[PDB]
Point group: C3
Chain length 390, copies 3
C-alpha cells in the first residue's frame, strides 16, 4: 500500500549520514528498506488547526430595546439623552415639526434625539491561522510485525529511536498550497469555511475587534438598525432580520470545512527530510503503466488553483508509475503542473488520487500513455476573492 | 555563456543519487557535465503572473446625473425621495430657508433632500498575487547538438527524461525577493505598478470590493461628489475631475511593470535542487579576476532594498570570479550582501549583472581586487510604503 | 562551550562536496572538526531590524486652537467658514435657537458652523518589518588560536575563505517563529512592542498614512475632539487628554522590545547549510544525561505559542543530551514539540535554555529520565490578537 522510495530521493554519504526526501500526503504512505533490515513506513495521519485567534466578530442578527426619545420645542434648545454617552446605545439626531398641536407655542422645528440599545443575537467569527495553530501527526512504523511524531511549523524536527535503524530525525514542513496569510477561518452557527481575508474585512456588517474585552462594543450598528420617521415626541427604531441567509448565499463556492470545538481538520501535505546514520538503502523503481485508466469519480476543483483526479487502473503491470501530462488550449505539453509526489498504482484495485495545477483558461489533462490515454478538457477561471455579500 | 557548477554545489552519494544546487536568474544559465556525457544547461526563460484576483476597484473619475431634489415647507414635515433607498444614488439632507417668497406660509427652515446617480467612468484595480498566479518556464538542454519545464509554487517539482542522463527532477522554488503578501499589482488605464498593500487600501478614493457582483456598488462616493449650496427647491450636485494625474504623481517611484492582458512578466529568480541517479559530475572552478572592471551603466535601485550593478571586465583571465565586497559608512567589510549566485565573467566581452543589498545609510560597493578595484559610494534610504496621494 | 555536530547532520559526497546542517541560536555555538584540521566554530552574534517602514501614525494626544464659529439668523441662510476647506481644521454644523435676544428678528433655528485647528502633540507609530529590514551577524572561527558573515533574507548566502578548510558557503535562513506578516513594530515615546497587525489597524485613534507627505493630515479627528454645546454665536471645542495610559494598559502582555534609533535587536534563530569541499568530518555523539536537572529560573512564556525553560544539570556525565518529553493533559507523549536543535549539557556548571511548543490546554513538560525527572504541569491558552483598547 506504500510507495517505495526511489534512489533519486536519497544519498548515502561516503561518511556522515543517509539523507532521504519524502512527501507525505493524506492517504498515501511511503516506505523503504536497508541492507538487510526491516521495512520502514512513514505516513501522515492528520492535520489540525487548534484554537485560532479571532480577527473580528460580525453581527448577522441584532435586536433593539430601551428605545428612548427626547424632544424640545423650537425655543427650548437642543434635546439630550444620557445614553448618548453609552456605547451599547445607537443614537440619532434630527429636527421635527413642533407647534401648538403638540405642546409648543411656536410652529417650527424642534430638536429630537433618539437612542436605542443594540444587542447582537447572532454573530459569526473570522479566525486567523498562525504557526502556533498548526499541527501534524506523522506515524513511523518499523515492520518487525509504531511511533507517532508531532510536527509543527515552529517545531518541524522530531528525533525518534527505531529498532534496527537507530535514531531517525523527521525534518518536515508544510507543502505550498493553502496560504493562511490570505485565507481566514469563518465560523457561523455550526458550519465553517475558508474565506479570503479582505473579503471578510470588507463585509458590510456590524463588527467588533477580536481583542480581549469585557464589554462587547460594536461598530457600524447603523447597518442593522433603521430609525423610522420621527414624530414630535416619539420615534420608532427597528432592526434588520437575520443575515444568515444572505451570508450562506455569499459563501456559495467557498470551501466548507469540519471543526469540532476549537479544532479544524485539514487534508495536510508534508515534505520531509529523513536523517539517519550512514546506511545503504534499497531504492524502489516503478515502470510506467501501460494499460488504461478509468475515472472512478468526477474531476473535483479546489479553491486555490488545483483539481483532484481519482483514477482506476485497468492494466496488468502494477505496481507502476501513472503517466501524466498537461496541455494548454493548444496542445503544448507543460512538463510540470503535477502536484502529487508519488503518482503510483501500487495496487490495481485501489483508485489513485492525482492533484494537478492546470493552466488558466482551456487545457487538457492526460493520464495513461498512447491511444489508451484518458483525455479530459478543462477550463480554469481566473482567481477571485469570493462573492459579493449583498 | 553558462556558468559552470562548482563541486561545492553537488554531492554524489556512495549510494542513491547525485544532488545538485543551482540558482537560475534571468539572463544567466548554468551548466555541468558528467563522467563522459554531453554538456547539460539549465536556464530560466520567463516568469509570469496570470489572472491575479482583484482586491478592490477604485474610482478616479466619476460622473453625476438624475439629480433629484425634494423640499418641504417648515410645517410640511421631512422631505423624502425613493432614490434614498437606491444604492446607485448618493444623497444628502439639510434644512433651507423657506417662506412666502417660495410658496410657504411661514418664514422658517424647510427640509430638503437631494439625491444624484453616481457612476464610475474611470477606475483602477488592485490585484493580489497568490501562489496559483505565479509560473516559471525553465529550459533544460542536453548538448547532443531542449525541454521546457513548468515550475509553480504549488508544483515546484518537474521530472524530465534526458538523453544519456536519464530522469532529472527539477525541484525549484522562488528566491526571497519580491513579497506578494506585501506588494500589490495596481492597474490604471494601461500602465501597471507594484505598490504596497496598505498604501493602496488607505487610498482616499471611492472603492468597491473585488468580490463577484452583478451590481457595481461604490463606497465613499462623497470623495468625488460635491453638493453645492441648496436653494428652496433645488440644489446642484457636481463631481471632481479625473484623478489620473493625482495618482500618477503619487505613484512616482513605484516600480512600473509590463502586462499584456491578464499576464504580467517579471524578472524571476529560482533556487533549484536537481536530482539525478548516482553520477560523478565534473565540477567547474573559477579563479578570481585580476584585471579591471568598468561600469557599463549607472547603478540602478530596486524598490525592495537592492541595487543592480552591471560591469565590464578589462582583464585577460576570463572566465573568472568577480571579486565583490561591501563596506558600511566606516570601512567594515560585511562578508555578505551579495545576491547574485554566480558572479562570473564567463565572457570578457559580455557585461555582468550584479545584484547586492547595501546597508542602510552610507556605504561602499567594491568590484575587483587591489588598487584596480572599482569603488562606489552608495546611500540607502530607510524603507517606505510609498508617497501620499493628495 | 560549543555543541558538536552529529554525523546525522552532514554527508561527505563520494564526489562533490561535504554538506552540513546546523541550527544557530542566540547564546549557543556549534562546532566540528575534519580529518586532521583545526576546530571550526559557528555562532549567531546578533539579529537586527533596521529602518522598518511606517504603516500608519496614530495620535494619542491632540490639541485644539483657532476655534472659529459662524452663525446666521433664521432668515439669513447657511453659515460658512473658509476653514471648512482646510484639512488642518475639524468642523461641525448645527442649528441653534436664534431670536430677538441675540440680534435676530425671528425666534427660530439659525445655522451654525464651528471649525477648530487640530494638531497631534503625541503620536505613536506602527512599523512593518520586511525582508530588507532583517539582518544577521554570524561569526565563523577557525581555531588556529574570526570572520563575521552578514546574512539577510534576500542575501542568505555568504562565501568565506578559511584557513586549512578553504572556501565555506554559509547558506542560512530564519527559522519559523516570529511572523512579520502578522506582527507589527509599535513605537510609543521610547518603548516598543510587537503587536498583531489588525489589532493595530483597528485601534480607535486618529490616524494618518505612513506614506510620504509634507502635510501631515489626520483621519478620525472626532475621536479626540469634543464640540461642546453651541450657543447663538459661539461654541467651545475641547480635546481629550493623552491616551498614553490607555495604550500602556491595552499593551499589557504584548512583548516589549529594545530599539536604539532605527535599529531593533531580536533574539534570532537560523538554520544553515554549510557547503565545503569533499571532506571527512568528525561527528560528535552525546549520551543521554542520567542525572537530575534543576530549574534555574521560572518557565517563561512567549507570545507566539512557545515557552522557555532554563535548567541546570546535577549529574556527572557531561557533556550529555538532555532527555526531553511533552505530554498532553492525559499522558500522551508527543514525540516532538522540541524547538531547540541542540539540547546539550556541554558544561555541568552552565544552565541550558530549552524552547518548546506545548499543546493547547493542560500538559506536562519533562526534562531528565526516570524517577530523577523534572515534571512540570503547564496550561496553554488559545491564541489572541491582543487586548481591547478602551
Ligand atoms: C431598560 O431595559 C429594562 C426594561 O425592560 C431595564 O430593566 C433596564 O435597566 C434598562 N436598561 C438601560 C441600560 O436603560
Ligand atoms: C433618469 O435618467 C434618464 C433620463 O436622462 C432616465 O431615462 C432614467 O430612466 C432615469 N434613471 C433613474 C434610475 O432615475
Ligand atoms: C490662528 O492662530 C494664530 C493666532 O494665535 C495665528 O497667528 C494664525 O495665523 C492662525 N491660524 C490659522 C490657520 O487660522
Ligand atoms: Cl402642530
Ligand atoms: Cl422668502
Ligand atoms: Cl432669544
Amino acid at each position: 500500500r506504500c510507495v517505495g522510495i526511489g534512489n533519486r530521493d536519497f544519498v548515502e554519504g561516503l561518511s556522515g549520514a543517509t539523507w532521504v526526501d519524502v512527501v507525505l500526503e493524506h492517504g498515501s504512505c511511503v516506505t523503504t528498506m536497508a541492507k538487510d533490515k526491516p521495512t520502514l513506513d512513514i505516513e501522515l495521519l492528520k492535520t489540525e488547526v487548534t484554537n485560532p485567534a479571532v480577527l473580528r466578530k460580525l453581527c448577522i442578527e441584532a435586536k433593539i430595546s430601551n428605545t428612548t426619545t427626547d424632544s424640545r420645542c423650537p425655543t427650548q434648545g437642543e434635546a439630550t439623552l444620557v445614553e448618548e454617552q453609552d456605547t451599547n446605545f445607537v443614537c440619532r439626531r434630527t429636527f421635527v415639526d413642533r407647534g401648538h398641536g403638540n405642546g409648543c407655542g411656536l410652529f417650527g422645528k424642534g430638536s429630537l434625539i433618539t437612542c436605542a440599545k443594540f444587542k447582537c443575537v447572532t454573530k459569526l467569527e473570522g479566525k486567523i491561522v498562525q504557526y502556533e495553530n498548526l499541527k501534524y501527526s506523522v506515524i513511523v512504523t518499523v515492520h518487525t510485525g509504531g511511533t507517532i511524531a508531532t510536527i509543527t511549523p515552529q517545531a518541524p524536527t522530531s528525533e525518534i529511536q527505531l529498532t534496527d535503524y537507530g535514531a531517525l530525525t523527521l525534518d518536515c514542513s508544510p507543502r505550498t498550497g493553502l496560504d493562511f496569510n490570505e485565507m481566514v477561518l469563518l465560523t457561523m452557527k455550526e458550519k465553517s469555511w475558508l474565506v479570503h481575508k479582505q473579503w471578510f474585512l470588507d463585509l458590510p456588517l456590524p463588527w467588533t475587534s477580536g481583542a480581549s474585552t469585557s464589554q462587547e462594543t460594536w461598530n457600524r450598528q447603523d447597518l442593522l438598525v433603521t430609525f423610522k420617521t420621527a414624530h414630535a415626541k416619539k420615534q420608532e427604531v427597528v432592526v434588520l432580520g437575520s443575515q444568515e441567509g444572505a451570508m450562506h448565499t455569499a459563501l456559495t463556492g467557498a470551501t466548507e470545512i469540519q471543526t469540532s470545538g476549537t479544532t479544524t481538520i485539514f487534508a495536510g501535505h508534508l515534505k520531509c527530510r529523513l536523517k539517519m546514520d550512514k546506511l545503504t538503502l534499497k531504492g524502489m523503481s516503478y515502470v510506467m503503466c501501460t494499460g488504461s485508466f478509468k475515472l472512478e469519480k468526477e474531476v473535483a476543483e479546489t479553491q486555490h488553483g488545483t483539481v483532484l483526479v481519482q483514477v482506476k487502473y485497468e492494466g496488468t503491470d502494477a505496481p507502476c508509475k501513472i503517466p501524466f501530462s498537461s496541455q494548454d488550449e493548444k496542445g503544448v505539453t507543460q512538463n510540470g503542473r503535477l502536484i502529487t509526489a508519488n503518482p503510483i498504482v501500487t495496487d490495481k484495485e485501489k483508485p489513485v488520487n492525482i492533484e494537478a495545477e492546470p493552466p488558466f483558461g482551456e487545457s487538457y489533462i492526460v493520464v495513461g500513455a498512447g491511444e489508451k490515454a484518458l483525455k479530459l478538457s478543462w477550463f480554469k477561471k481566473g482567481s477571485s476573492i469570493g462573492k459579493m455579500f449583498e
